[PDB]
Design an enzyme around this catalytic site. Structure first.
Site, PDB file in Angstrom:
ATOM      1  N   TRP A   1     -11.354   9.292   3.901  1.00 22.38           N
ATOM      2  CA  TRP A   1     -11.220   7.921   3.424  1.00 22.38           C
ATOM      3  C   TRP A   1     -11.189   6.934   4.583  1.00 22.38           C
ATOM      4  CZ3 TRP A   1     -11.705   4.327  -0.036  1.00 22.38           C
ATOM      5  CH2 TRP A   1     -10.960   3.145   0.067  1.00 22.38           C
TER       6      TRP A   1
ATOM      7  N   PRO B   1     -11.588 -13.758 -19.166  1.00 19.13           N
ATOM      8  CA  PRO B   1     -12.894 -13.860 -19.836  1.00 19.13           C
ATOM      9  C   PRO B   1     -13.264 -12.616 -20.628  1.00 19.13           C
ATOM     10  CG  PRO B   1     -13.032 -14.690 -17.594  1.00 19.13           C
ATOM     11  CD  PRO B   1     -11.676 -14.063 -17.728  1.00 19.13           C
TER      12      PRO B   1
ATOM     13  N   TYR C   1     -21.488  -1.421 -11.566  1.00 20.94           N
ATOM     14  CA  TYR C   1     -21.810  -2.639 -10.830  1.00 20.94           C
ATOM     15  C   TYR C   1     -22.927  -2.407  -9.819  1.00 20.94           C
ATOM     16  CZ  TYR C   1     -17.062  -2.802 -12.624  1.00 20.94           C
ATOM     17  OH  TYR C   1     -15.944  -2.681 -13.417  1.00 20.94           O
TER      18      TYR C   1
ATOM     19  N   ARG D   1       0.826  -1.201   0.000  1.00 19.99           N
ATOM     20  CA  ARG D   1       0.000   0.000   0.000  1.00 19.99           C
ATOM     21  C   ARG D   1       0.861   1.252   0.000  1.00 19.99           C
ATOM     22  NH1 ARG D   1      -5.024  -0.303  -0.587  1.00 19.99           N
ATOM     23  NH2 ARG D   1      -6.433  -1.790   0.435  1.00 19.99           N
TER      24      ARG D   1
ATOM     25  N   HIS E   1     -21.409 -17.324 -18.346  1.00 17.20           N
ATOM     26  CA  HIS E   1     -21.349 -15.878 -18.176  1.00 17.20           C
ATOM     27  C   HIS E   1     -20.821 -15.201 -19.433  1.00 17.20           C
ATOM     28  CE1 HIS E   1     -19.478 -12.048 -16.835  1.00 17.20           C
ATOM     29  NE2 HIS E   1     -20.558 -11.974 -16.079  1.00 17.20           N
ATOM     30  N   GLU E   2     -19.775 -15.771 -20.030  1.00 12.30           N
ATOM     31  CA  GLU E   2     -19.190 -15.182 -21.228  1.00 12.30           C
ATOM     32  C   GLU E   2     -20.097 -15.360 -22.440  1.00 12.30           C
ATOM     33  OE1 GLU E   2     -16.725 -13.126 -21.798  1.00 12.30           O
ATOM     34  OE2 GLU E   2     -16.732 -13.041 -19.607  1.00 12.30           O
TER      35      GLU E   2
ATOM     36  N   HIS F   1     -23.171 -12.682 -22.913  1.00 11.87           N
ATOM     37  CA  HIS F   1     -22.929 -11.390 -23.547  1.00 11.87           C
ATOM     38  C   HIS F   1     -22.793 -11.535 -25.057  1.00 11.87           C
ATOM     39  CE1 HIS F   1     -22.236 -10.488 -19.373  1.00 11.87           C
ATOM     40  NE2 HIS F   1     -21.118 -11.188 -19.352  1.00 11.87           N
TER      41      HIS F   1
ATOM     42  N   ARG G   1     -13.018  -6.731  -0.926  1.00 14.76           N
ATOM     43  CA  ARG G   1     -14.179  -6.808  -1.805  1.00 14.76           C
ATOM     44  C   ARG G   1     -15.143  -7.900  -1.357  1.00 14.76           C
ATOM     45  NH1 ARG G   1     -13.254  -5.443  -8.164  1.00 14.76           N
ATOM     46  NH2 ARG G   1     -15.425  -4.909  -8.652  1.00 14.76           N
TER      47      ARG G   1
ATOM     48  N   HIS H   1      -9.795   0.452 -10.589  1.00 15.72           N
ATOM     49  CA  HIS H   1     -10.569   1.486 -11.269  1.00 15.72           C
ATOM     50  C   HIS H   1     -10.058   2.887 -10.957  1.00 15.72           C
ATOM     51  CE1 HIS H   1     -12.929  -2.136 -10.626  1.00 15.72           C
ATOM     52  NE2 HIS H   1     -13.674  -1.821 -11.671  1.00 15.72           N
TER      53      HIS H   1
ATOM     54  N   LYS I   1     -14.433   4.200   6.520  1.00 17.64           N
ATOM     55  CA  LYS I   1     -14.039   2.795   6.557  1.00 17.64           C
ATOM     56  C   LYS I   1     -14.498   2.135   7.849  1.00 17.64           C
ATOM     57  CE  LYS I   1     -11.140   0.375   4.420  1.00 17.64           C
ATOM     58  NZ  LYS I   1     -11.175  -0.713   3.404  1.00 17.64           N
TER      59      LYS I   1
HETATM   60  C1  LIG Z   1     -16.633   5.322 -26.007  1.00 18.92           C
HETATM   61  O1  LIG Z   1     -15.279   5.080 -26.319  1.00 18.92           O
HETATM   62  C2  LIG Z   1     -14.601   4.401 -25.249  1.00 18.92           C
HETATM   63  C3  LIG Z   1     -13.155   4.267 -25.667  1.00 18.92           C
HETATM   64  O2  LIG Z   1     -12.301   5.042 -24.836  1.00 18.92           O
HETATM   65  C4  LIG Z   1     -15.259   3.051 -24.935  1.00 18.92           C
HETATM   66  O3  LIG Z   1     -14.723   2.602 -23.696  1.00 18.92           O
HETATM   67  C5  LIG Z   1     -14.327   1.220 -23.737  1.00 18.92           C
HETATM   68  O4  LIG Z   1     -15.427   0.336 -23.492  1.00 18.92           O
HETATM   69  C6  LIG Z   1     -15.074  -1.055 -23.519  1.00 18.92           C
HETATM   70  C7  LIG Z   1     -16.356  -1.834 -23.334  1.00 18.92           C
HETATM   71  O5  LIG Z   1     -16.680  -1.985 -21.958  1.00 18.92           O
HETATM   72  C8  LIG Z   1     -14.032  -1.353 -22.444  1.00 18.92           C
HETATM   73  O6  LIG Z   1     -13.624  -2.713 -22.552  1.00 18.92           O
HETATM   74  C9  LIG Z   1     -13.741  -3.380 -21.277  1.00 18.92           C
HETATM   75  O7  LIG Z   1     -12.456  -3.689 -20.749  1.00 18.92           O
HETATM   76  C10 LIG Z   1     -12.489  -4.394 -19.499  1.00 18.92           C
HETATM   77  C11 LIG Z   1     -11.068  -4.512 -18.980  1.00 18.92           C
HETATM   78  O8  LIG Z   1     -10.416  -5.567 -19.680  1.00 18.92           O
HETATM   79  C12 LIG Z   1      -8.988  -5.383 -19.570  1.00 18.92           C
HETATM   80  O9  LIG Z   1      -8.449  -6.233 -18.567  1.00 18.92           O
HETATM   81  C13 LIG Z   1      -8.569  -7.650 -18.816  1.00 18.92           C
HETATM   82  C14 LIG Z   1      -7.979  -8.373 -17.618  1.00 18.92           C
HETATM   83  O10 LIG Z   1      -8.899  -8.267 -16.536  1.00 18.92           O
HETATM   84  C15 LIG Z   1      -7.856  -7.992 -20.134  1.00 18.92           C
HETATM   85  O11 LIG Z   1      -8.014  -9.372 -20.416  1.00 18.92           O
HETATM   86  C16 LIG Z   1      -8.457  -7.164 -21.271  1.00 18.92           C
HETATM   87  O12 LIG Z   1      -7.821  -7.491 -22.503  1.00 18.92           O
HETATM   88  C17 LIG Z   1      -8.364  -5.673 -20.958  1.00 18.92           C
HETATM   89  O13 LIG Z   1      -6.969  -5.365 -20.969  1.00 18.92           O
HETATM   90  C18 LIG Z   1     -13.147  -5.757 -19.737  1.00 18.92           C
HETATM   91  O14 LIG Z   1     -13.171  -6.490 -18.523  1.00 18.92           O
HETATM   92  C19 LIG Z   1     -14.575  -5.557 -20.258  1.00 18.92           C
HETATM   93  O15 LIG Z   1     -15.175  -6.822 -20.525  1.00 18.92           O
HETATM   94  C20 LIG Z   1     -16.381  -6.944 -19.739  1.00 18.92           C
HETATM   95  O16 LIG Z   1     -17.514  -7.174 -20.581  1.00 18.92           O
HETATM   96  C21 LIG Z   1     -17.554  -8.449 -21.260  1.00 18.92           C
HETATM   97  C22 LIG Z   1     -18.789  -8.471 -22.136  1.00 18.92           C
HETATM   98  O17 LIG Z   1     -18.610  -7.526 -23.182  1.00 18.92           O
HETATM   99  C23 LIG Z   1     -17.560  -9.558 -20.211  1.00 18.92           C
HETATM  100  O18 LIG Z   1     -17.640 -10.814 -20.859  1.00 18.92           O
HETATM  101  C24 LIG Z   1     -16.273  -9.467 -19.384  1.00 18.92           C
HETATM  102  O19 LIG Z   1     -16.213 -10.534 -18.441  1.00 18.92           O
HETATM  103  C25 LIG Z   1     -16.160  -8.095 -18.707  1.00 18.92           C
HETATM  104  O20 LIG Z   1     -17.161  -8.077 -17.687  1.00 18.92           O
HETATM  105  C26 LIG Z   1     -14.600  -4.655 -21.496  1.00 18.92           C
HETATM  106  O21 LIG Z   1     -14.087  -5.429 -22.570  1.00 18.92           O
HETATM  107  C27 LIG Z   1     -12.824  -0.440 -22.614  1.00 18.92           C
HETATM  108  O22 LIG Z   1     -11.916  -0.630 -21.534  1.00 18.92           O
HETATM  109  C28 LIG Z   1     -13.261   1.021 -22.662  1.00 18.92           C
HETATM  110  N1  LIG Z   1     -12.119   1.890 -22.892  1.00 18.92           N
HETATM  111  C29 LIG Z   1     -11.733   2.833 -22.027  1.00 18.92           C
HETATM  112  C30 LIG Z   1     -10.533   3.639 -22.425  1.00 18.92           C
HETATM  113  O23 LIG Z   1     -12.325   3.028 -20.971  1.00 18.92           O
HETATM  114  C31 LIG Z   1     -16.775   3.165 -24.791  1.00 18.92           C
HETATM  115  O24 LIG Z   1     -17.366   1.871 -24.800  1.00 18.92           O
HETATM  116  C32 LIG Z   1     -17.370   4.002 -25.917  1.00 18.92           C
HETATM  117  N2  LIG Z   1     -18.794   4.209 -25.706  1.00 18.92           N
HETATM  118  C33 LIG Z   1     -19.738   3.652 -26.473  1.00 18.92           C
HETATM  119  C34 LIG Z   1     -19.249   2.778 -27.591  1.00 18.92           C
HETATM  120  O25 LIG Z   1     -20.933   3.844 -26.275  1.00 18.92           O
END
Ligand SMILES: *[C@@H]1O[C@H](CO)[C@@H](O[C@@H]2O[C@H](CO)[C@@H](O[C@@H]3O[C@H](CO[C@H]4O[C@H](CO)[C@@H](O)[C@H](O)[C@@H]4O)[C@@H](O)[C@H](O[C@H]4O[C@H](CO)[C@@H](O)[C@H](O)[C@@H]4O)[C@@H]3O)[C@H](O)[C@H]2NC(C)=O)[C@H](O)[C@H]1NC(C)=O
Ligand SMILES: *[C@@H]1O[C@H](CO)[C@@H](O[C@@H]2O[C@H](CO)[C@@H](O[C@@H]3O[C@H](CO)[C@@H](O)[C@H](O)[C@@H]3O)[C@H](O)[C@H]2NC(C)=O)[C@H](O)[C@H]1NC(C)=O
Ligand SMILES: *[C@@H]1O[C@H](CO)[C@@H](O[C@@H]2O[C@H](CO)[C@@H](O)[C@H](O)[C@H]2NC(C)=O)[C@H](O)[C@H]1NC(C)=O
Ligand SMILES: *[C@@H]1O[C@H](CO)[C@@H](O[C@@H]2O[C@H](CO)[C@@H](O)[C@H](O)[C@H]2NC(C)=O)[C@H](O)[C@H]1NC(C)=O
Ligand SMILES: *[C@@H]1O[C@H](CO)[C@@H](O)[C@H](O)[C@H]1NC(C)=O
Ligand SMILES: *[C@@H]1O[C@H](CO)[C@@H](O)[C@H](O)[C@H]1NC(C)=O
EC number: 3.4.17.23
Lengths: 596, 198
Positions: free
Chosen positions: A459, A328, A497, A151, A356-357, A360, A255, A487, A463
């Site tokens: 913060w 996933p 969420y 931390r 789950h996958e 979607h 969490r 995040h 807690k």
């Molecule tokens: C406006 O434009 C922005 C671009 O800046 C878009 O923002 C992106 O949105 C997508 C869609 O959600 C985001 O993609 C998400 O990324 C998450 C993180 O994944 C990273 O980490 C994992 C490891 O944990 C790696 O394996 C992976 O390769 C990545 O490096 C994912 O977890 C998300 O998936 C979720 O949804 C799917 C279903 O679709 C589930 O099955 C999954 O389990 C999971 O819950 C998702 O893929 C992306 O990060 C955004 N970019 C940014 C910069 O924030 C907006 O979407 C767009 N607005 C629109 C189009 O309206």
């Protein structure tokens, strides 16, 4: 002639271009995902650059036609999307500083390392052991040292970086049509154009407080049990009614408490409903599990996956130089190409994750016929809920009997359902306090109520209050616990969420109600149902042409959020918590401090 | 010439091979004035858009036909032959035409997608180019693959047909009472060998 005719003429080519270039970029990224090499990295980066840069040439002409003379509302929403997600206000210097801060945040968080105690010889990262040292190791001294060191080594470096990032985001939002970046996150759920379904931005604070308080007695009831079981293995460390130390949570961010299932077991002598042991006996493998997952959609009535998907998706890790990341992902590329990149083991948990996958992907395939600019769910959380409801329904003993791995001789009693109820609550109920408190602290820090030097103090004020967990070692403004979070350190809205959890329960109860299904709410399978499947498919192909309030009122006949399905799901467990905690105090002592 | 209609039945089963203005059973025994052989490539979803009367949003864009189109239009996949993993951007089509087209008329004459306040014409905003690249891949599902299609119009009109199906024959039996037909010479009798000098 009119605004709409010119706008649709402009959008005709851009819709195809948004299909084409986005598909090219996503295909480069997906080829890199299936094949991790430097040239695939370059192709992914260049494709993304060209796609996002081409977005500018069309967003420039999108703002050319304003939004105050639009009657179809397809042009209006699509132009709003163009003027938001393809437009910006920050000058080159401010945007460059913002992106540099993001890159440095990601670099420090991913490359940050903590070494073994009293030694610099061996050093470890967060993913290898820290997610597992908290999960598995239970020693007080070792966990405390690792927690403090990690931390510190993240928050101390990243806290001024976050202080600069929040100010830059606030300036950008002020230059935008928002009061602050906190409001910018508050505007994600916003609705406009349709009276009776418009969403007011100020209700987001008011709505959350409505139900959470009513569920506060439950969580402390759960806290009435956990502190009882933890003191079984940690007698001297924990106060009888006082706050819990913030280094034995079992996870870095507190969490979940589900991983303490053995620690927090109600009854530890009844065997779990396990089919993984029986999986080997019946020659099961990945293809059998995925084919029965497809048969789930076959029986409910949702369209099943095409052979093109099954041919190209990588089910198993190739290894060697053909390395990948099997996290996933439900890839949404379009043009008929929807593929799943996730490595699956022969287990029931991977079976749940496969459902789950695939959910979607089902949703994306259902609404792919919609225009690419409107190929989105009602909001961020609906897409998650679509797969989450099926993943939850894949945890039913009766359908697991129908699987055949679990013999039909299996029995239903107290200790084959209550044991699962407690685990499900620890998954769902236990995450609520931190889940709301993180958003609350982010709103407070972005809004500007707290003075800078008090930013950390607040913060640690809540807690002890919301979660009932106190630090084991005080952390001043130098430390930044949210800087160790995924995040916050990378600027990702966490509000998705706290609404998807509310929506999925309503969806599940609608499916269980329209299908005429009886029994406790933890026994409900929709495989042999058609009304539930059809009523879900009604929403599946709609797309973005509806808001989240209207779409939610198309589920249970209720526009806004509710918590009744969630309370009903754990209602026998609510009775259990009330009954078994009669002599245990309800609540927590904030003033208590285990650190002398 | 002599046109047999069992030739395609020898070939692979063409998916959207359908007949509207003709008799399927009498195809091999019906006379038509001429034959037309319009052959082109469509993607799967809009294959039916090239329809008689029911002109789709592509038919008025690329190739239209009269309401009572007599004959058969044959459609079949050409994915593996005509798809590349890099995208068939060489295979183009006016996806952005403006109005209704006319039967038996190529869209080689470009119908510029001009609709707006701009007399821009050519290419650009409110003056876009109708042509769109298919960008096909062999990996695409249904509806985004090059279904190669042909229009085999069986026109039969005032001009003499002279284009009919074939006619088979049987054996020759001699010294036996029988009916016969020699290019349209009906009659019954006994056929023997003669010593005449035609
Ligand atoms: C406006 O434009 C922005 C671009 O800046 C878009 O923002 C992106 O949105 C997508 C869609 O959600 C985001 O993609 C998400 O990324 C998450 C993180 O994944 C990273 O980490 C994992 C490891 O944990 C790696 O394996 C992976 O390769 C990545 O490096 C994912 O977890 C998300 O998936 C979720 O949804 C799917 C279903 O679709 C589930 O099955 C999954 O389990 C999971 O819950 C998702 O893929 C992306 O990060 C955004 N970019 C940014 C910069 O924030 C907006 O979407 C767009 N607005 C629109 C189009 O309206
Ligand atoms: C407002 O915007 C929407 C979306 O752009 C328009 O929807 C479009 O409506 C037209 C006709 O209402 C649809 O054309 C139809 O196509 C089908 C199938 O080819 C055909 O059978 C019909 O006869 C008709 O030609 C078009 O497909 C549809 N577009 C989408 C993407 O769904 C709507 O028309 C706009 N409102 C007005 C008043 O124009
Ligand atoms: C993953 O990508 C790498 C390079 O991008 C591929 O390696 C090349 O493969 C081709 C095809 O056999 C060879 O002609 C090249 O000589 C290879 N180059 C290198 C540097 O290895 C690799 O084949 C890809 N993986 C798969 C499974 O196709
Ligand atoms: C949905 O229907 C199918 C078929 O009607 C059920 O499958 C049967 O399950 C029972 C018990 O699991 C077996 O004894 C039968 O042999 C199965 N029949 C077939 C054809 O598979 C399935 O169990 C039903 N769903 C649920 C949740 O019970
Ligand atoms: C599942 O997919 C197969 C494709 O091989 C198809 O034949 C079958 O009809 C599908 N099932 C349902 C219920 O549509
Ligand atoms: C176990 O289930 C039975 C149902 O017959 C019930 O009477 C009993 O109270 C349950 N036990 C507990 C501890 O709730």
């Amino acid at each position: 002639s009119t605004i709409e005719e010119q706008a649709k003429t402009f959008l005709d080519k851009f819709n195809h271009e948004a299909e084409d270039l986005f598909y090219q970029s996503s295909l480069a990224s997906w080829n890199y995902n299936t094949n991790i090499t430097e040239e695939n990295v370059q192709n992914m980066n260049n494709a993304g650059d060209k796609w996002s840069a081409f977005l500018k040439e069309q967003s420039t002409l999108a703002q050319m036609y304003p939004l105050q003379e639009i009657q179809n509302l397809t042009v209006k929403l699509q132009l709003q999307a163009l003027q938001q997600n393809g437009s910006s206000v920050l000058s080159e210097d401010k945007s460059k500083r913002l992106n540099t801060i993001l890159n440095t945040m990601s670099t420090i968080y991913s490359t940050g390392k903590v070494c073994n105690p009293d030694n610099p010889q061996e050093c470890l990262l967060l993913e290898p052991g820290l997610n597992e040292i908290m999960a598995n190791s239970l020693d007080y001294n070792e966990r405390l040292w690792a927690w403090e060191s990690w931390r510190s080594e993240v928050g101390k470096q990243l806290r001024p970086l976050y202080e600069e990032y929040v100010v830059l985001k606030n300036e950008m939002a002020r230059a935008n049509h928002y009061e602050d970046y906190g409001d910018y996150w508050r505007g994600d759920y916003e609705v406009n154009g349709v009276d009776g379904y418009d969403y007011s931005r100020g209700q987001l604070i008011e709505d959350v407080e409505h139900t959470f308080e009513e569920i506060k007695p439950l969580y402390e009831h759960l806290h009435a049990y956990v502190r009882a079981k933890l003191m079984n293995a940690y007698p001297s460390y924990i106060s009888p009614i006082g706050c819990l130390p913030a280094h034995l949570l079992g996870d870095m961010w507190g969490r979940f408490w589900t991983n303490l299932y053995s620690l927090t077991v109600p009854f530890g002598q009844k065997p779990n409903i396990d089919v993984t042991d029986a999986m080997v006996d019946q020659a099961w493998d990945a293809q059998r599990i995925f084919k029965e997952a497809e048969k789930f959609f076959v029986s409910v009535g949702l369209p099943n996956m095409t052979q093109g998907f099954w041919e190209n998706s990588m089910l198993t890790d190739p290894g060697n130089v053909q390395k990948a990341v099997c996290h996933p992902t439900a890839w949404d590329l379009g043009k008929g190409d929807f593929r799943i990149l996730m490595c699956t083991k022969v287990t029931m948990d991977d079976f749940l994750t496969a459902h789950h996958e695939m959910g979607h992907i089902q949703y994306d395939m259902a609404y792919a016929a919609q225009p690419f600019l409107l190929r989105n769910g009602a909001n961020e959380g609906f897409h998650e809920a679509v797969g989450e409801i099926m993943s939850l329904s894949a945890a039913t003993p009766k359908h697991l009997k129908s699987i055949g791995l679990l013999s039909p001789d299996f029995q239903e009693d107290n200790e084959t359902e209550i044991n699962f109820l407690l685990k499900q609550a620890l998954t769902i109920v236990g995450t609520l306090p931190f889940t709301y408190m993180l958003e609350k602290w982010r709103w407070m820090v972005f809004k500007g109520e707290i003075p800078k030097d008090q930013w950390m103090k607040k913060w640690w004020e809540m807690k002890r209050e919301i979660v009932g967990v106190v630090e084991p070692v005080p952390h001043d403004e130098t430390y930044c616990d949210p800087a160790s979070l995924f995040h916050v350190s990378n600027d990702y809205s966490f509000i998705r969420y706290y609404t998807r959890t509310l929506y999925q329960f309503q969806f599940q109860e609608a499916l269980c109600q329209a299908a005429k299904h009886e029994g406790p709410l933890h026994k409900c399978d929709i495989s042999n149902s058609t009304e539930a499947g059809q009523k879900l498919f009604n929403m599946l192909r709609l797309g973005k042409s509806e808001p989240w309030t209207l779409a939610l009122e198309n589920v249970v006949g209720a526009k806004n959020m509710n918590v009744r399905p969630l309370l009903n799901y754990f209602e026998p467990l609510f009775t259990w918590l009330k009954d078994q905690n009669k002599n245990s105090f309800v609540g927590w002592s904030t003033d208590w401090s285990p650190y002398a | 010439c002599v046109a047999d209609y069992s030739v395609l039945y020898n070939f692979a089963p063409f998916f959207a091979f359908k007949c509207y203005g003709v008799s399927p059973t009498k195809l091999n025994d019906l006379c038509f004035t001429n034959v037309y052989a319009d052959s082109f490539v469509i993607k799967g979803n809009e294959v039916s858009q090239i329809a008689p009367g029911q002109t789709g949003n592509i038919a008025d864009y690329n190739y239209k036909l009269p309401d009572d189109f007599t004959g058969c239009v044959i459609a079949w996949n050409s994915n593996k032959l005509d798809s590349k993993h890099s995208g068939n951007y060489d295979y183009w089509y006016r996806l952005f035409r403006k109005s209704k087209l006319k039967p038996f008329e190529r869209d080689i004459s470009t119908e510029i997608y001009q609709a707006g306040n701009k007399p821009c014409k050519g290419k650009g905003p409110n003056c876009y180019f109708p042509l769109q690249s298919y960008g096909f891949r062999p990996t695409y599902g249904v509806g985004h693959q090059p279904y190669r299609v042909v229009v085999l119009s069986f026109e039969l009109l005032h001009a003499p047909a002279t284009v009919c199906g074939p006619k088979k024959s049987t054996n020759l039996v001699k010294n036996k009472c029988v009916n016969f037909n020699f290019n349209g010479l009906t009659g019954t009798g006994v056929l023997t060998k003669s010593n005449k000098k035609f």
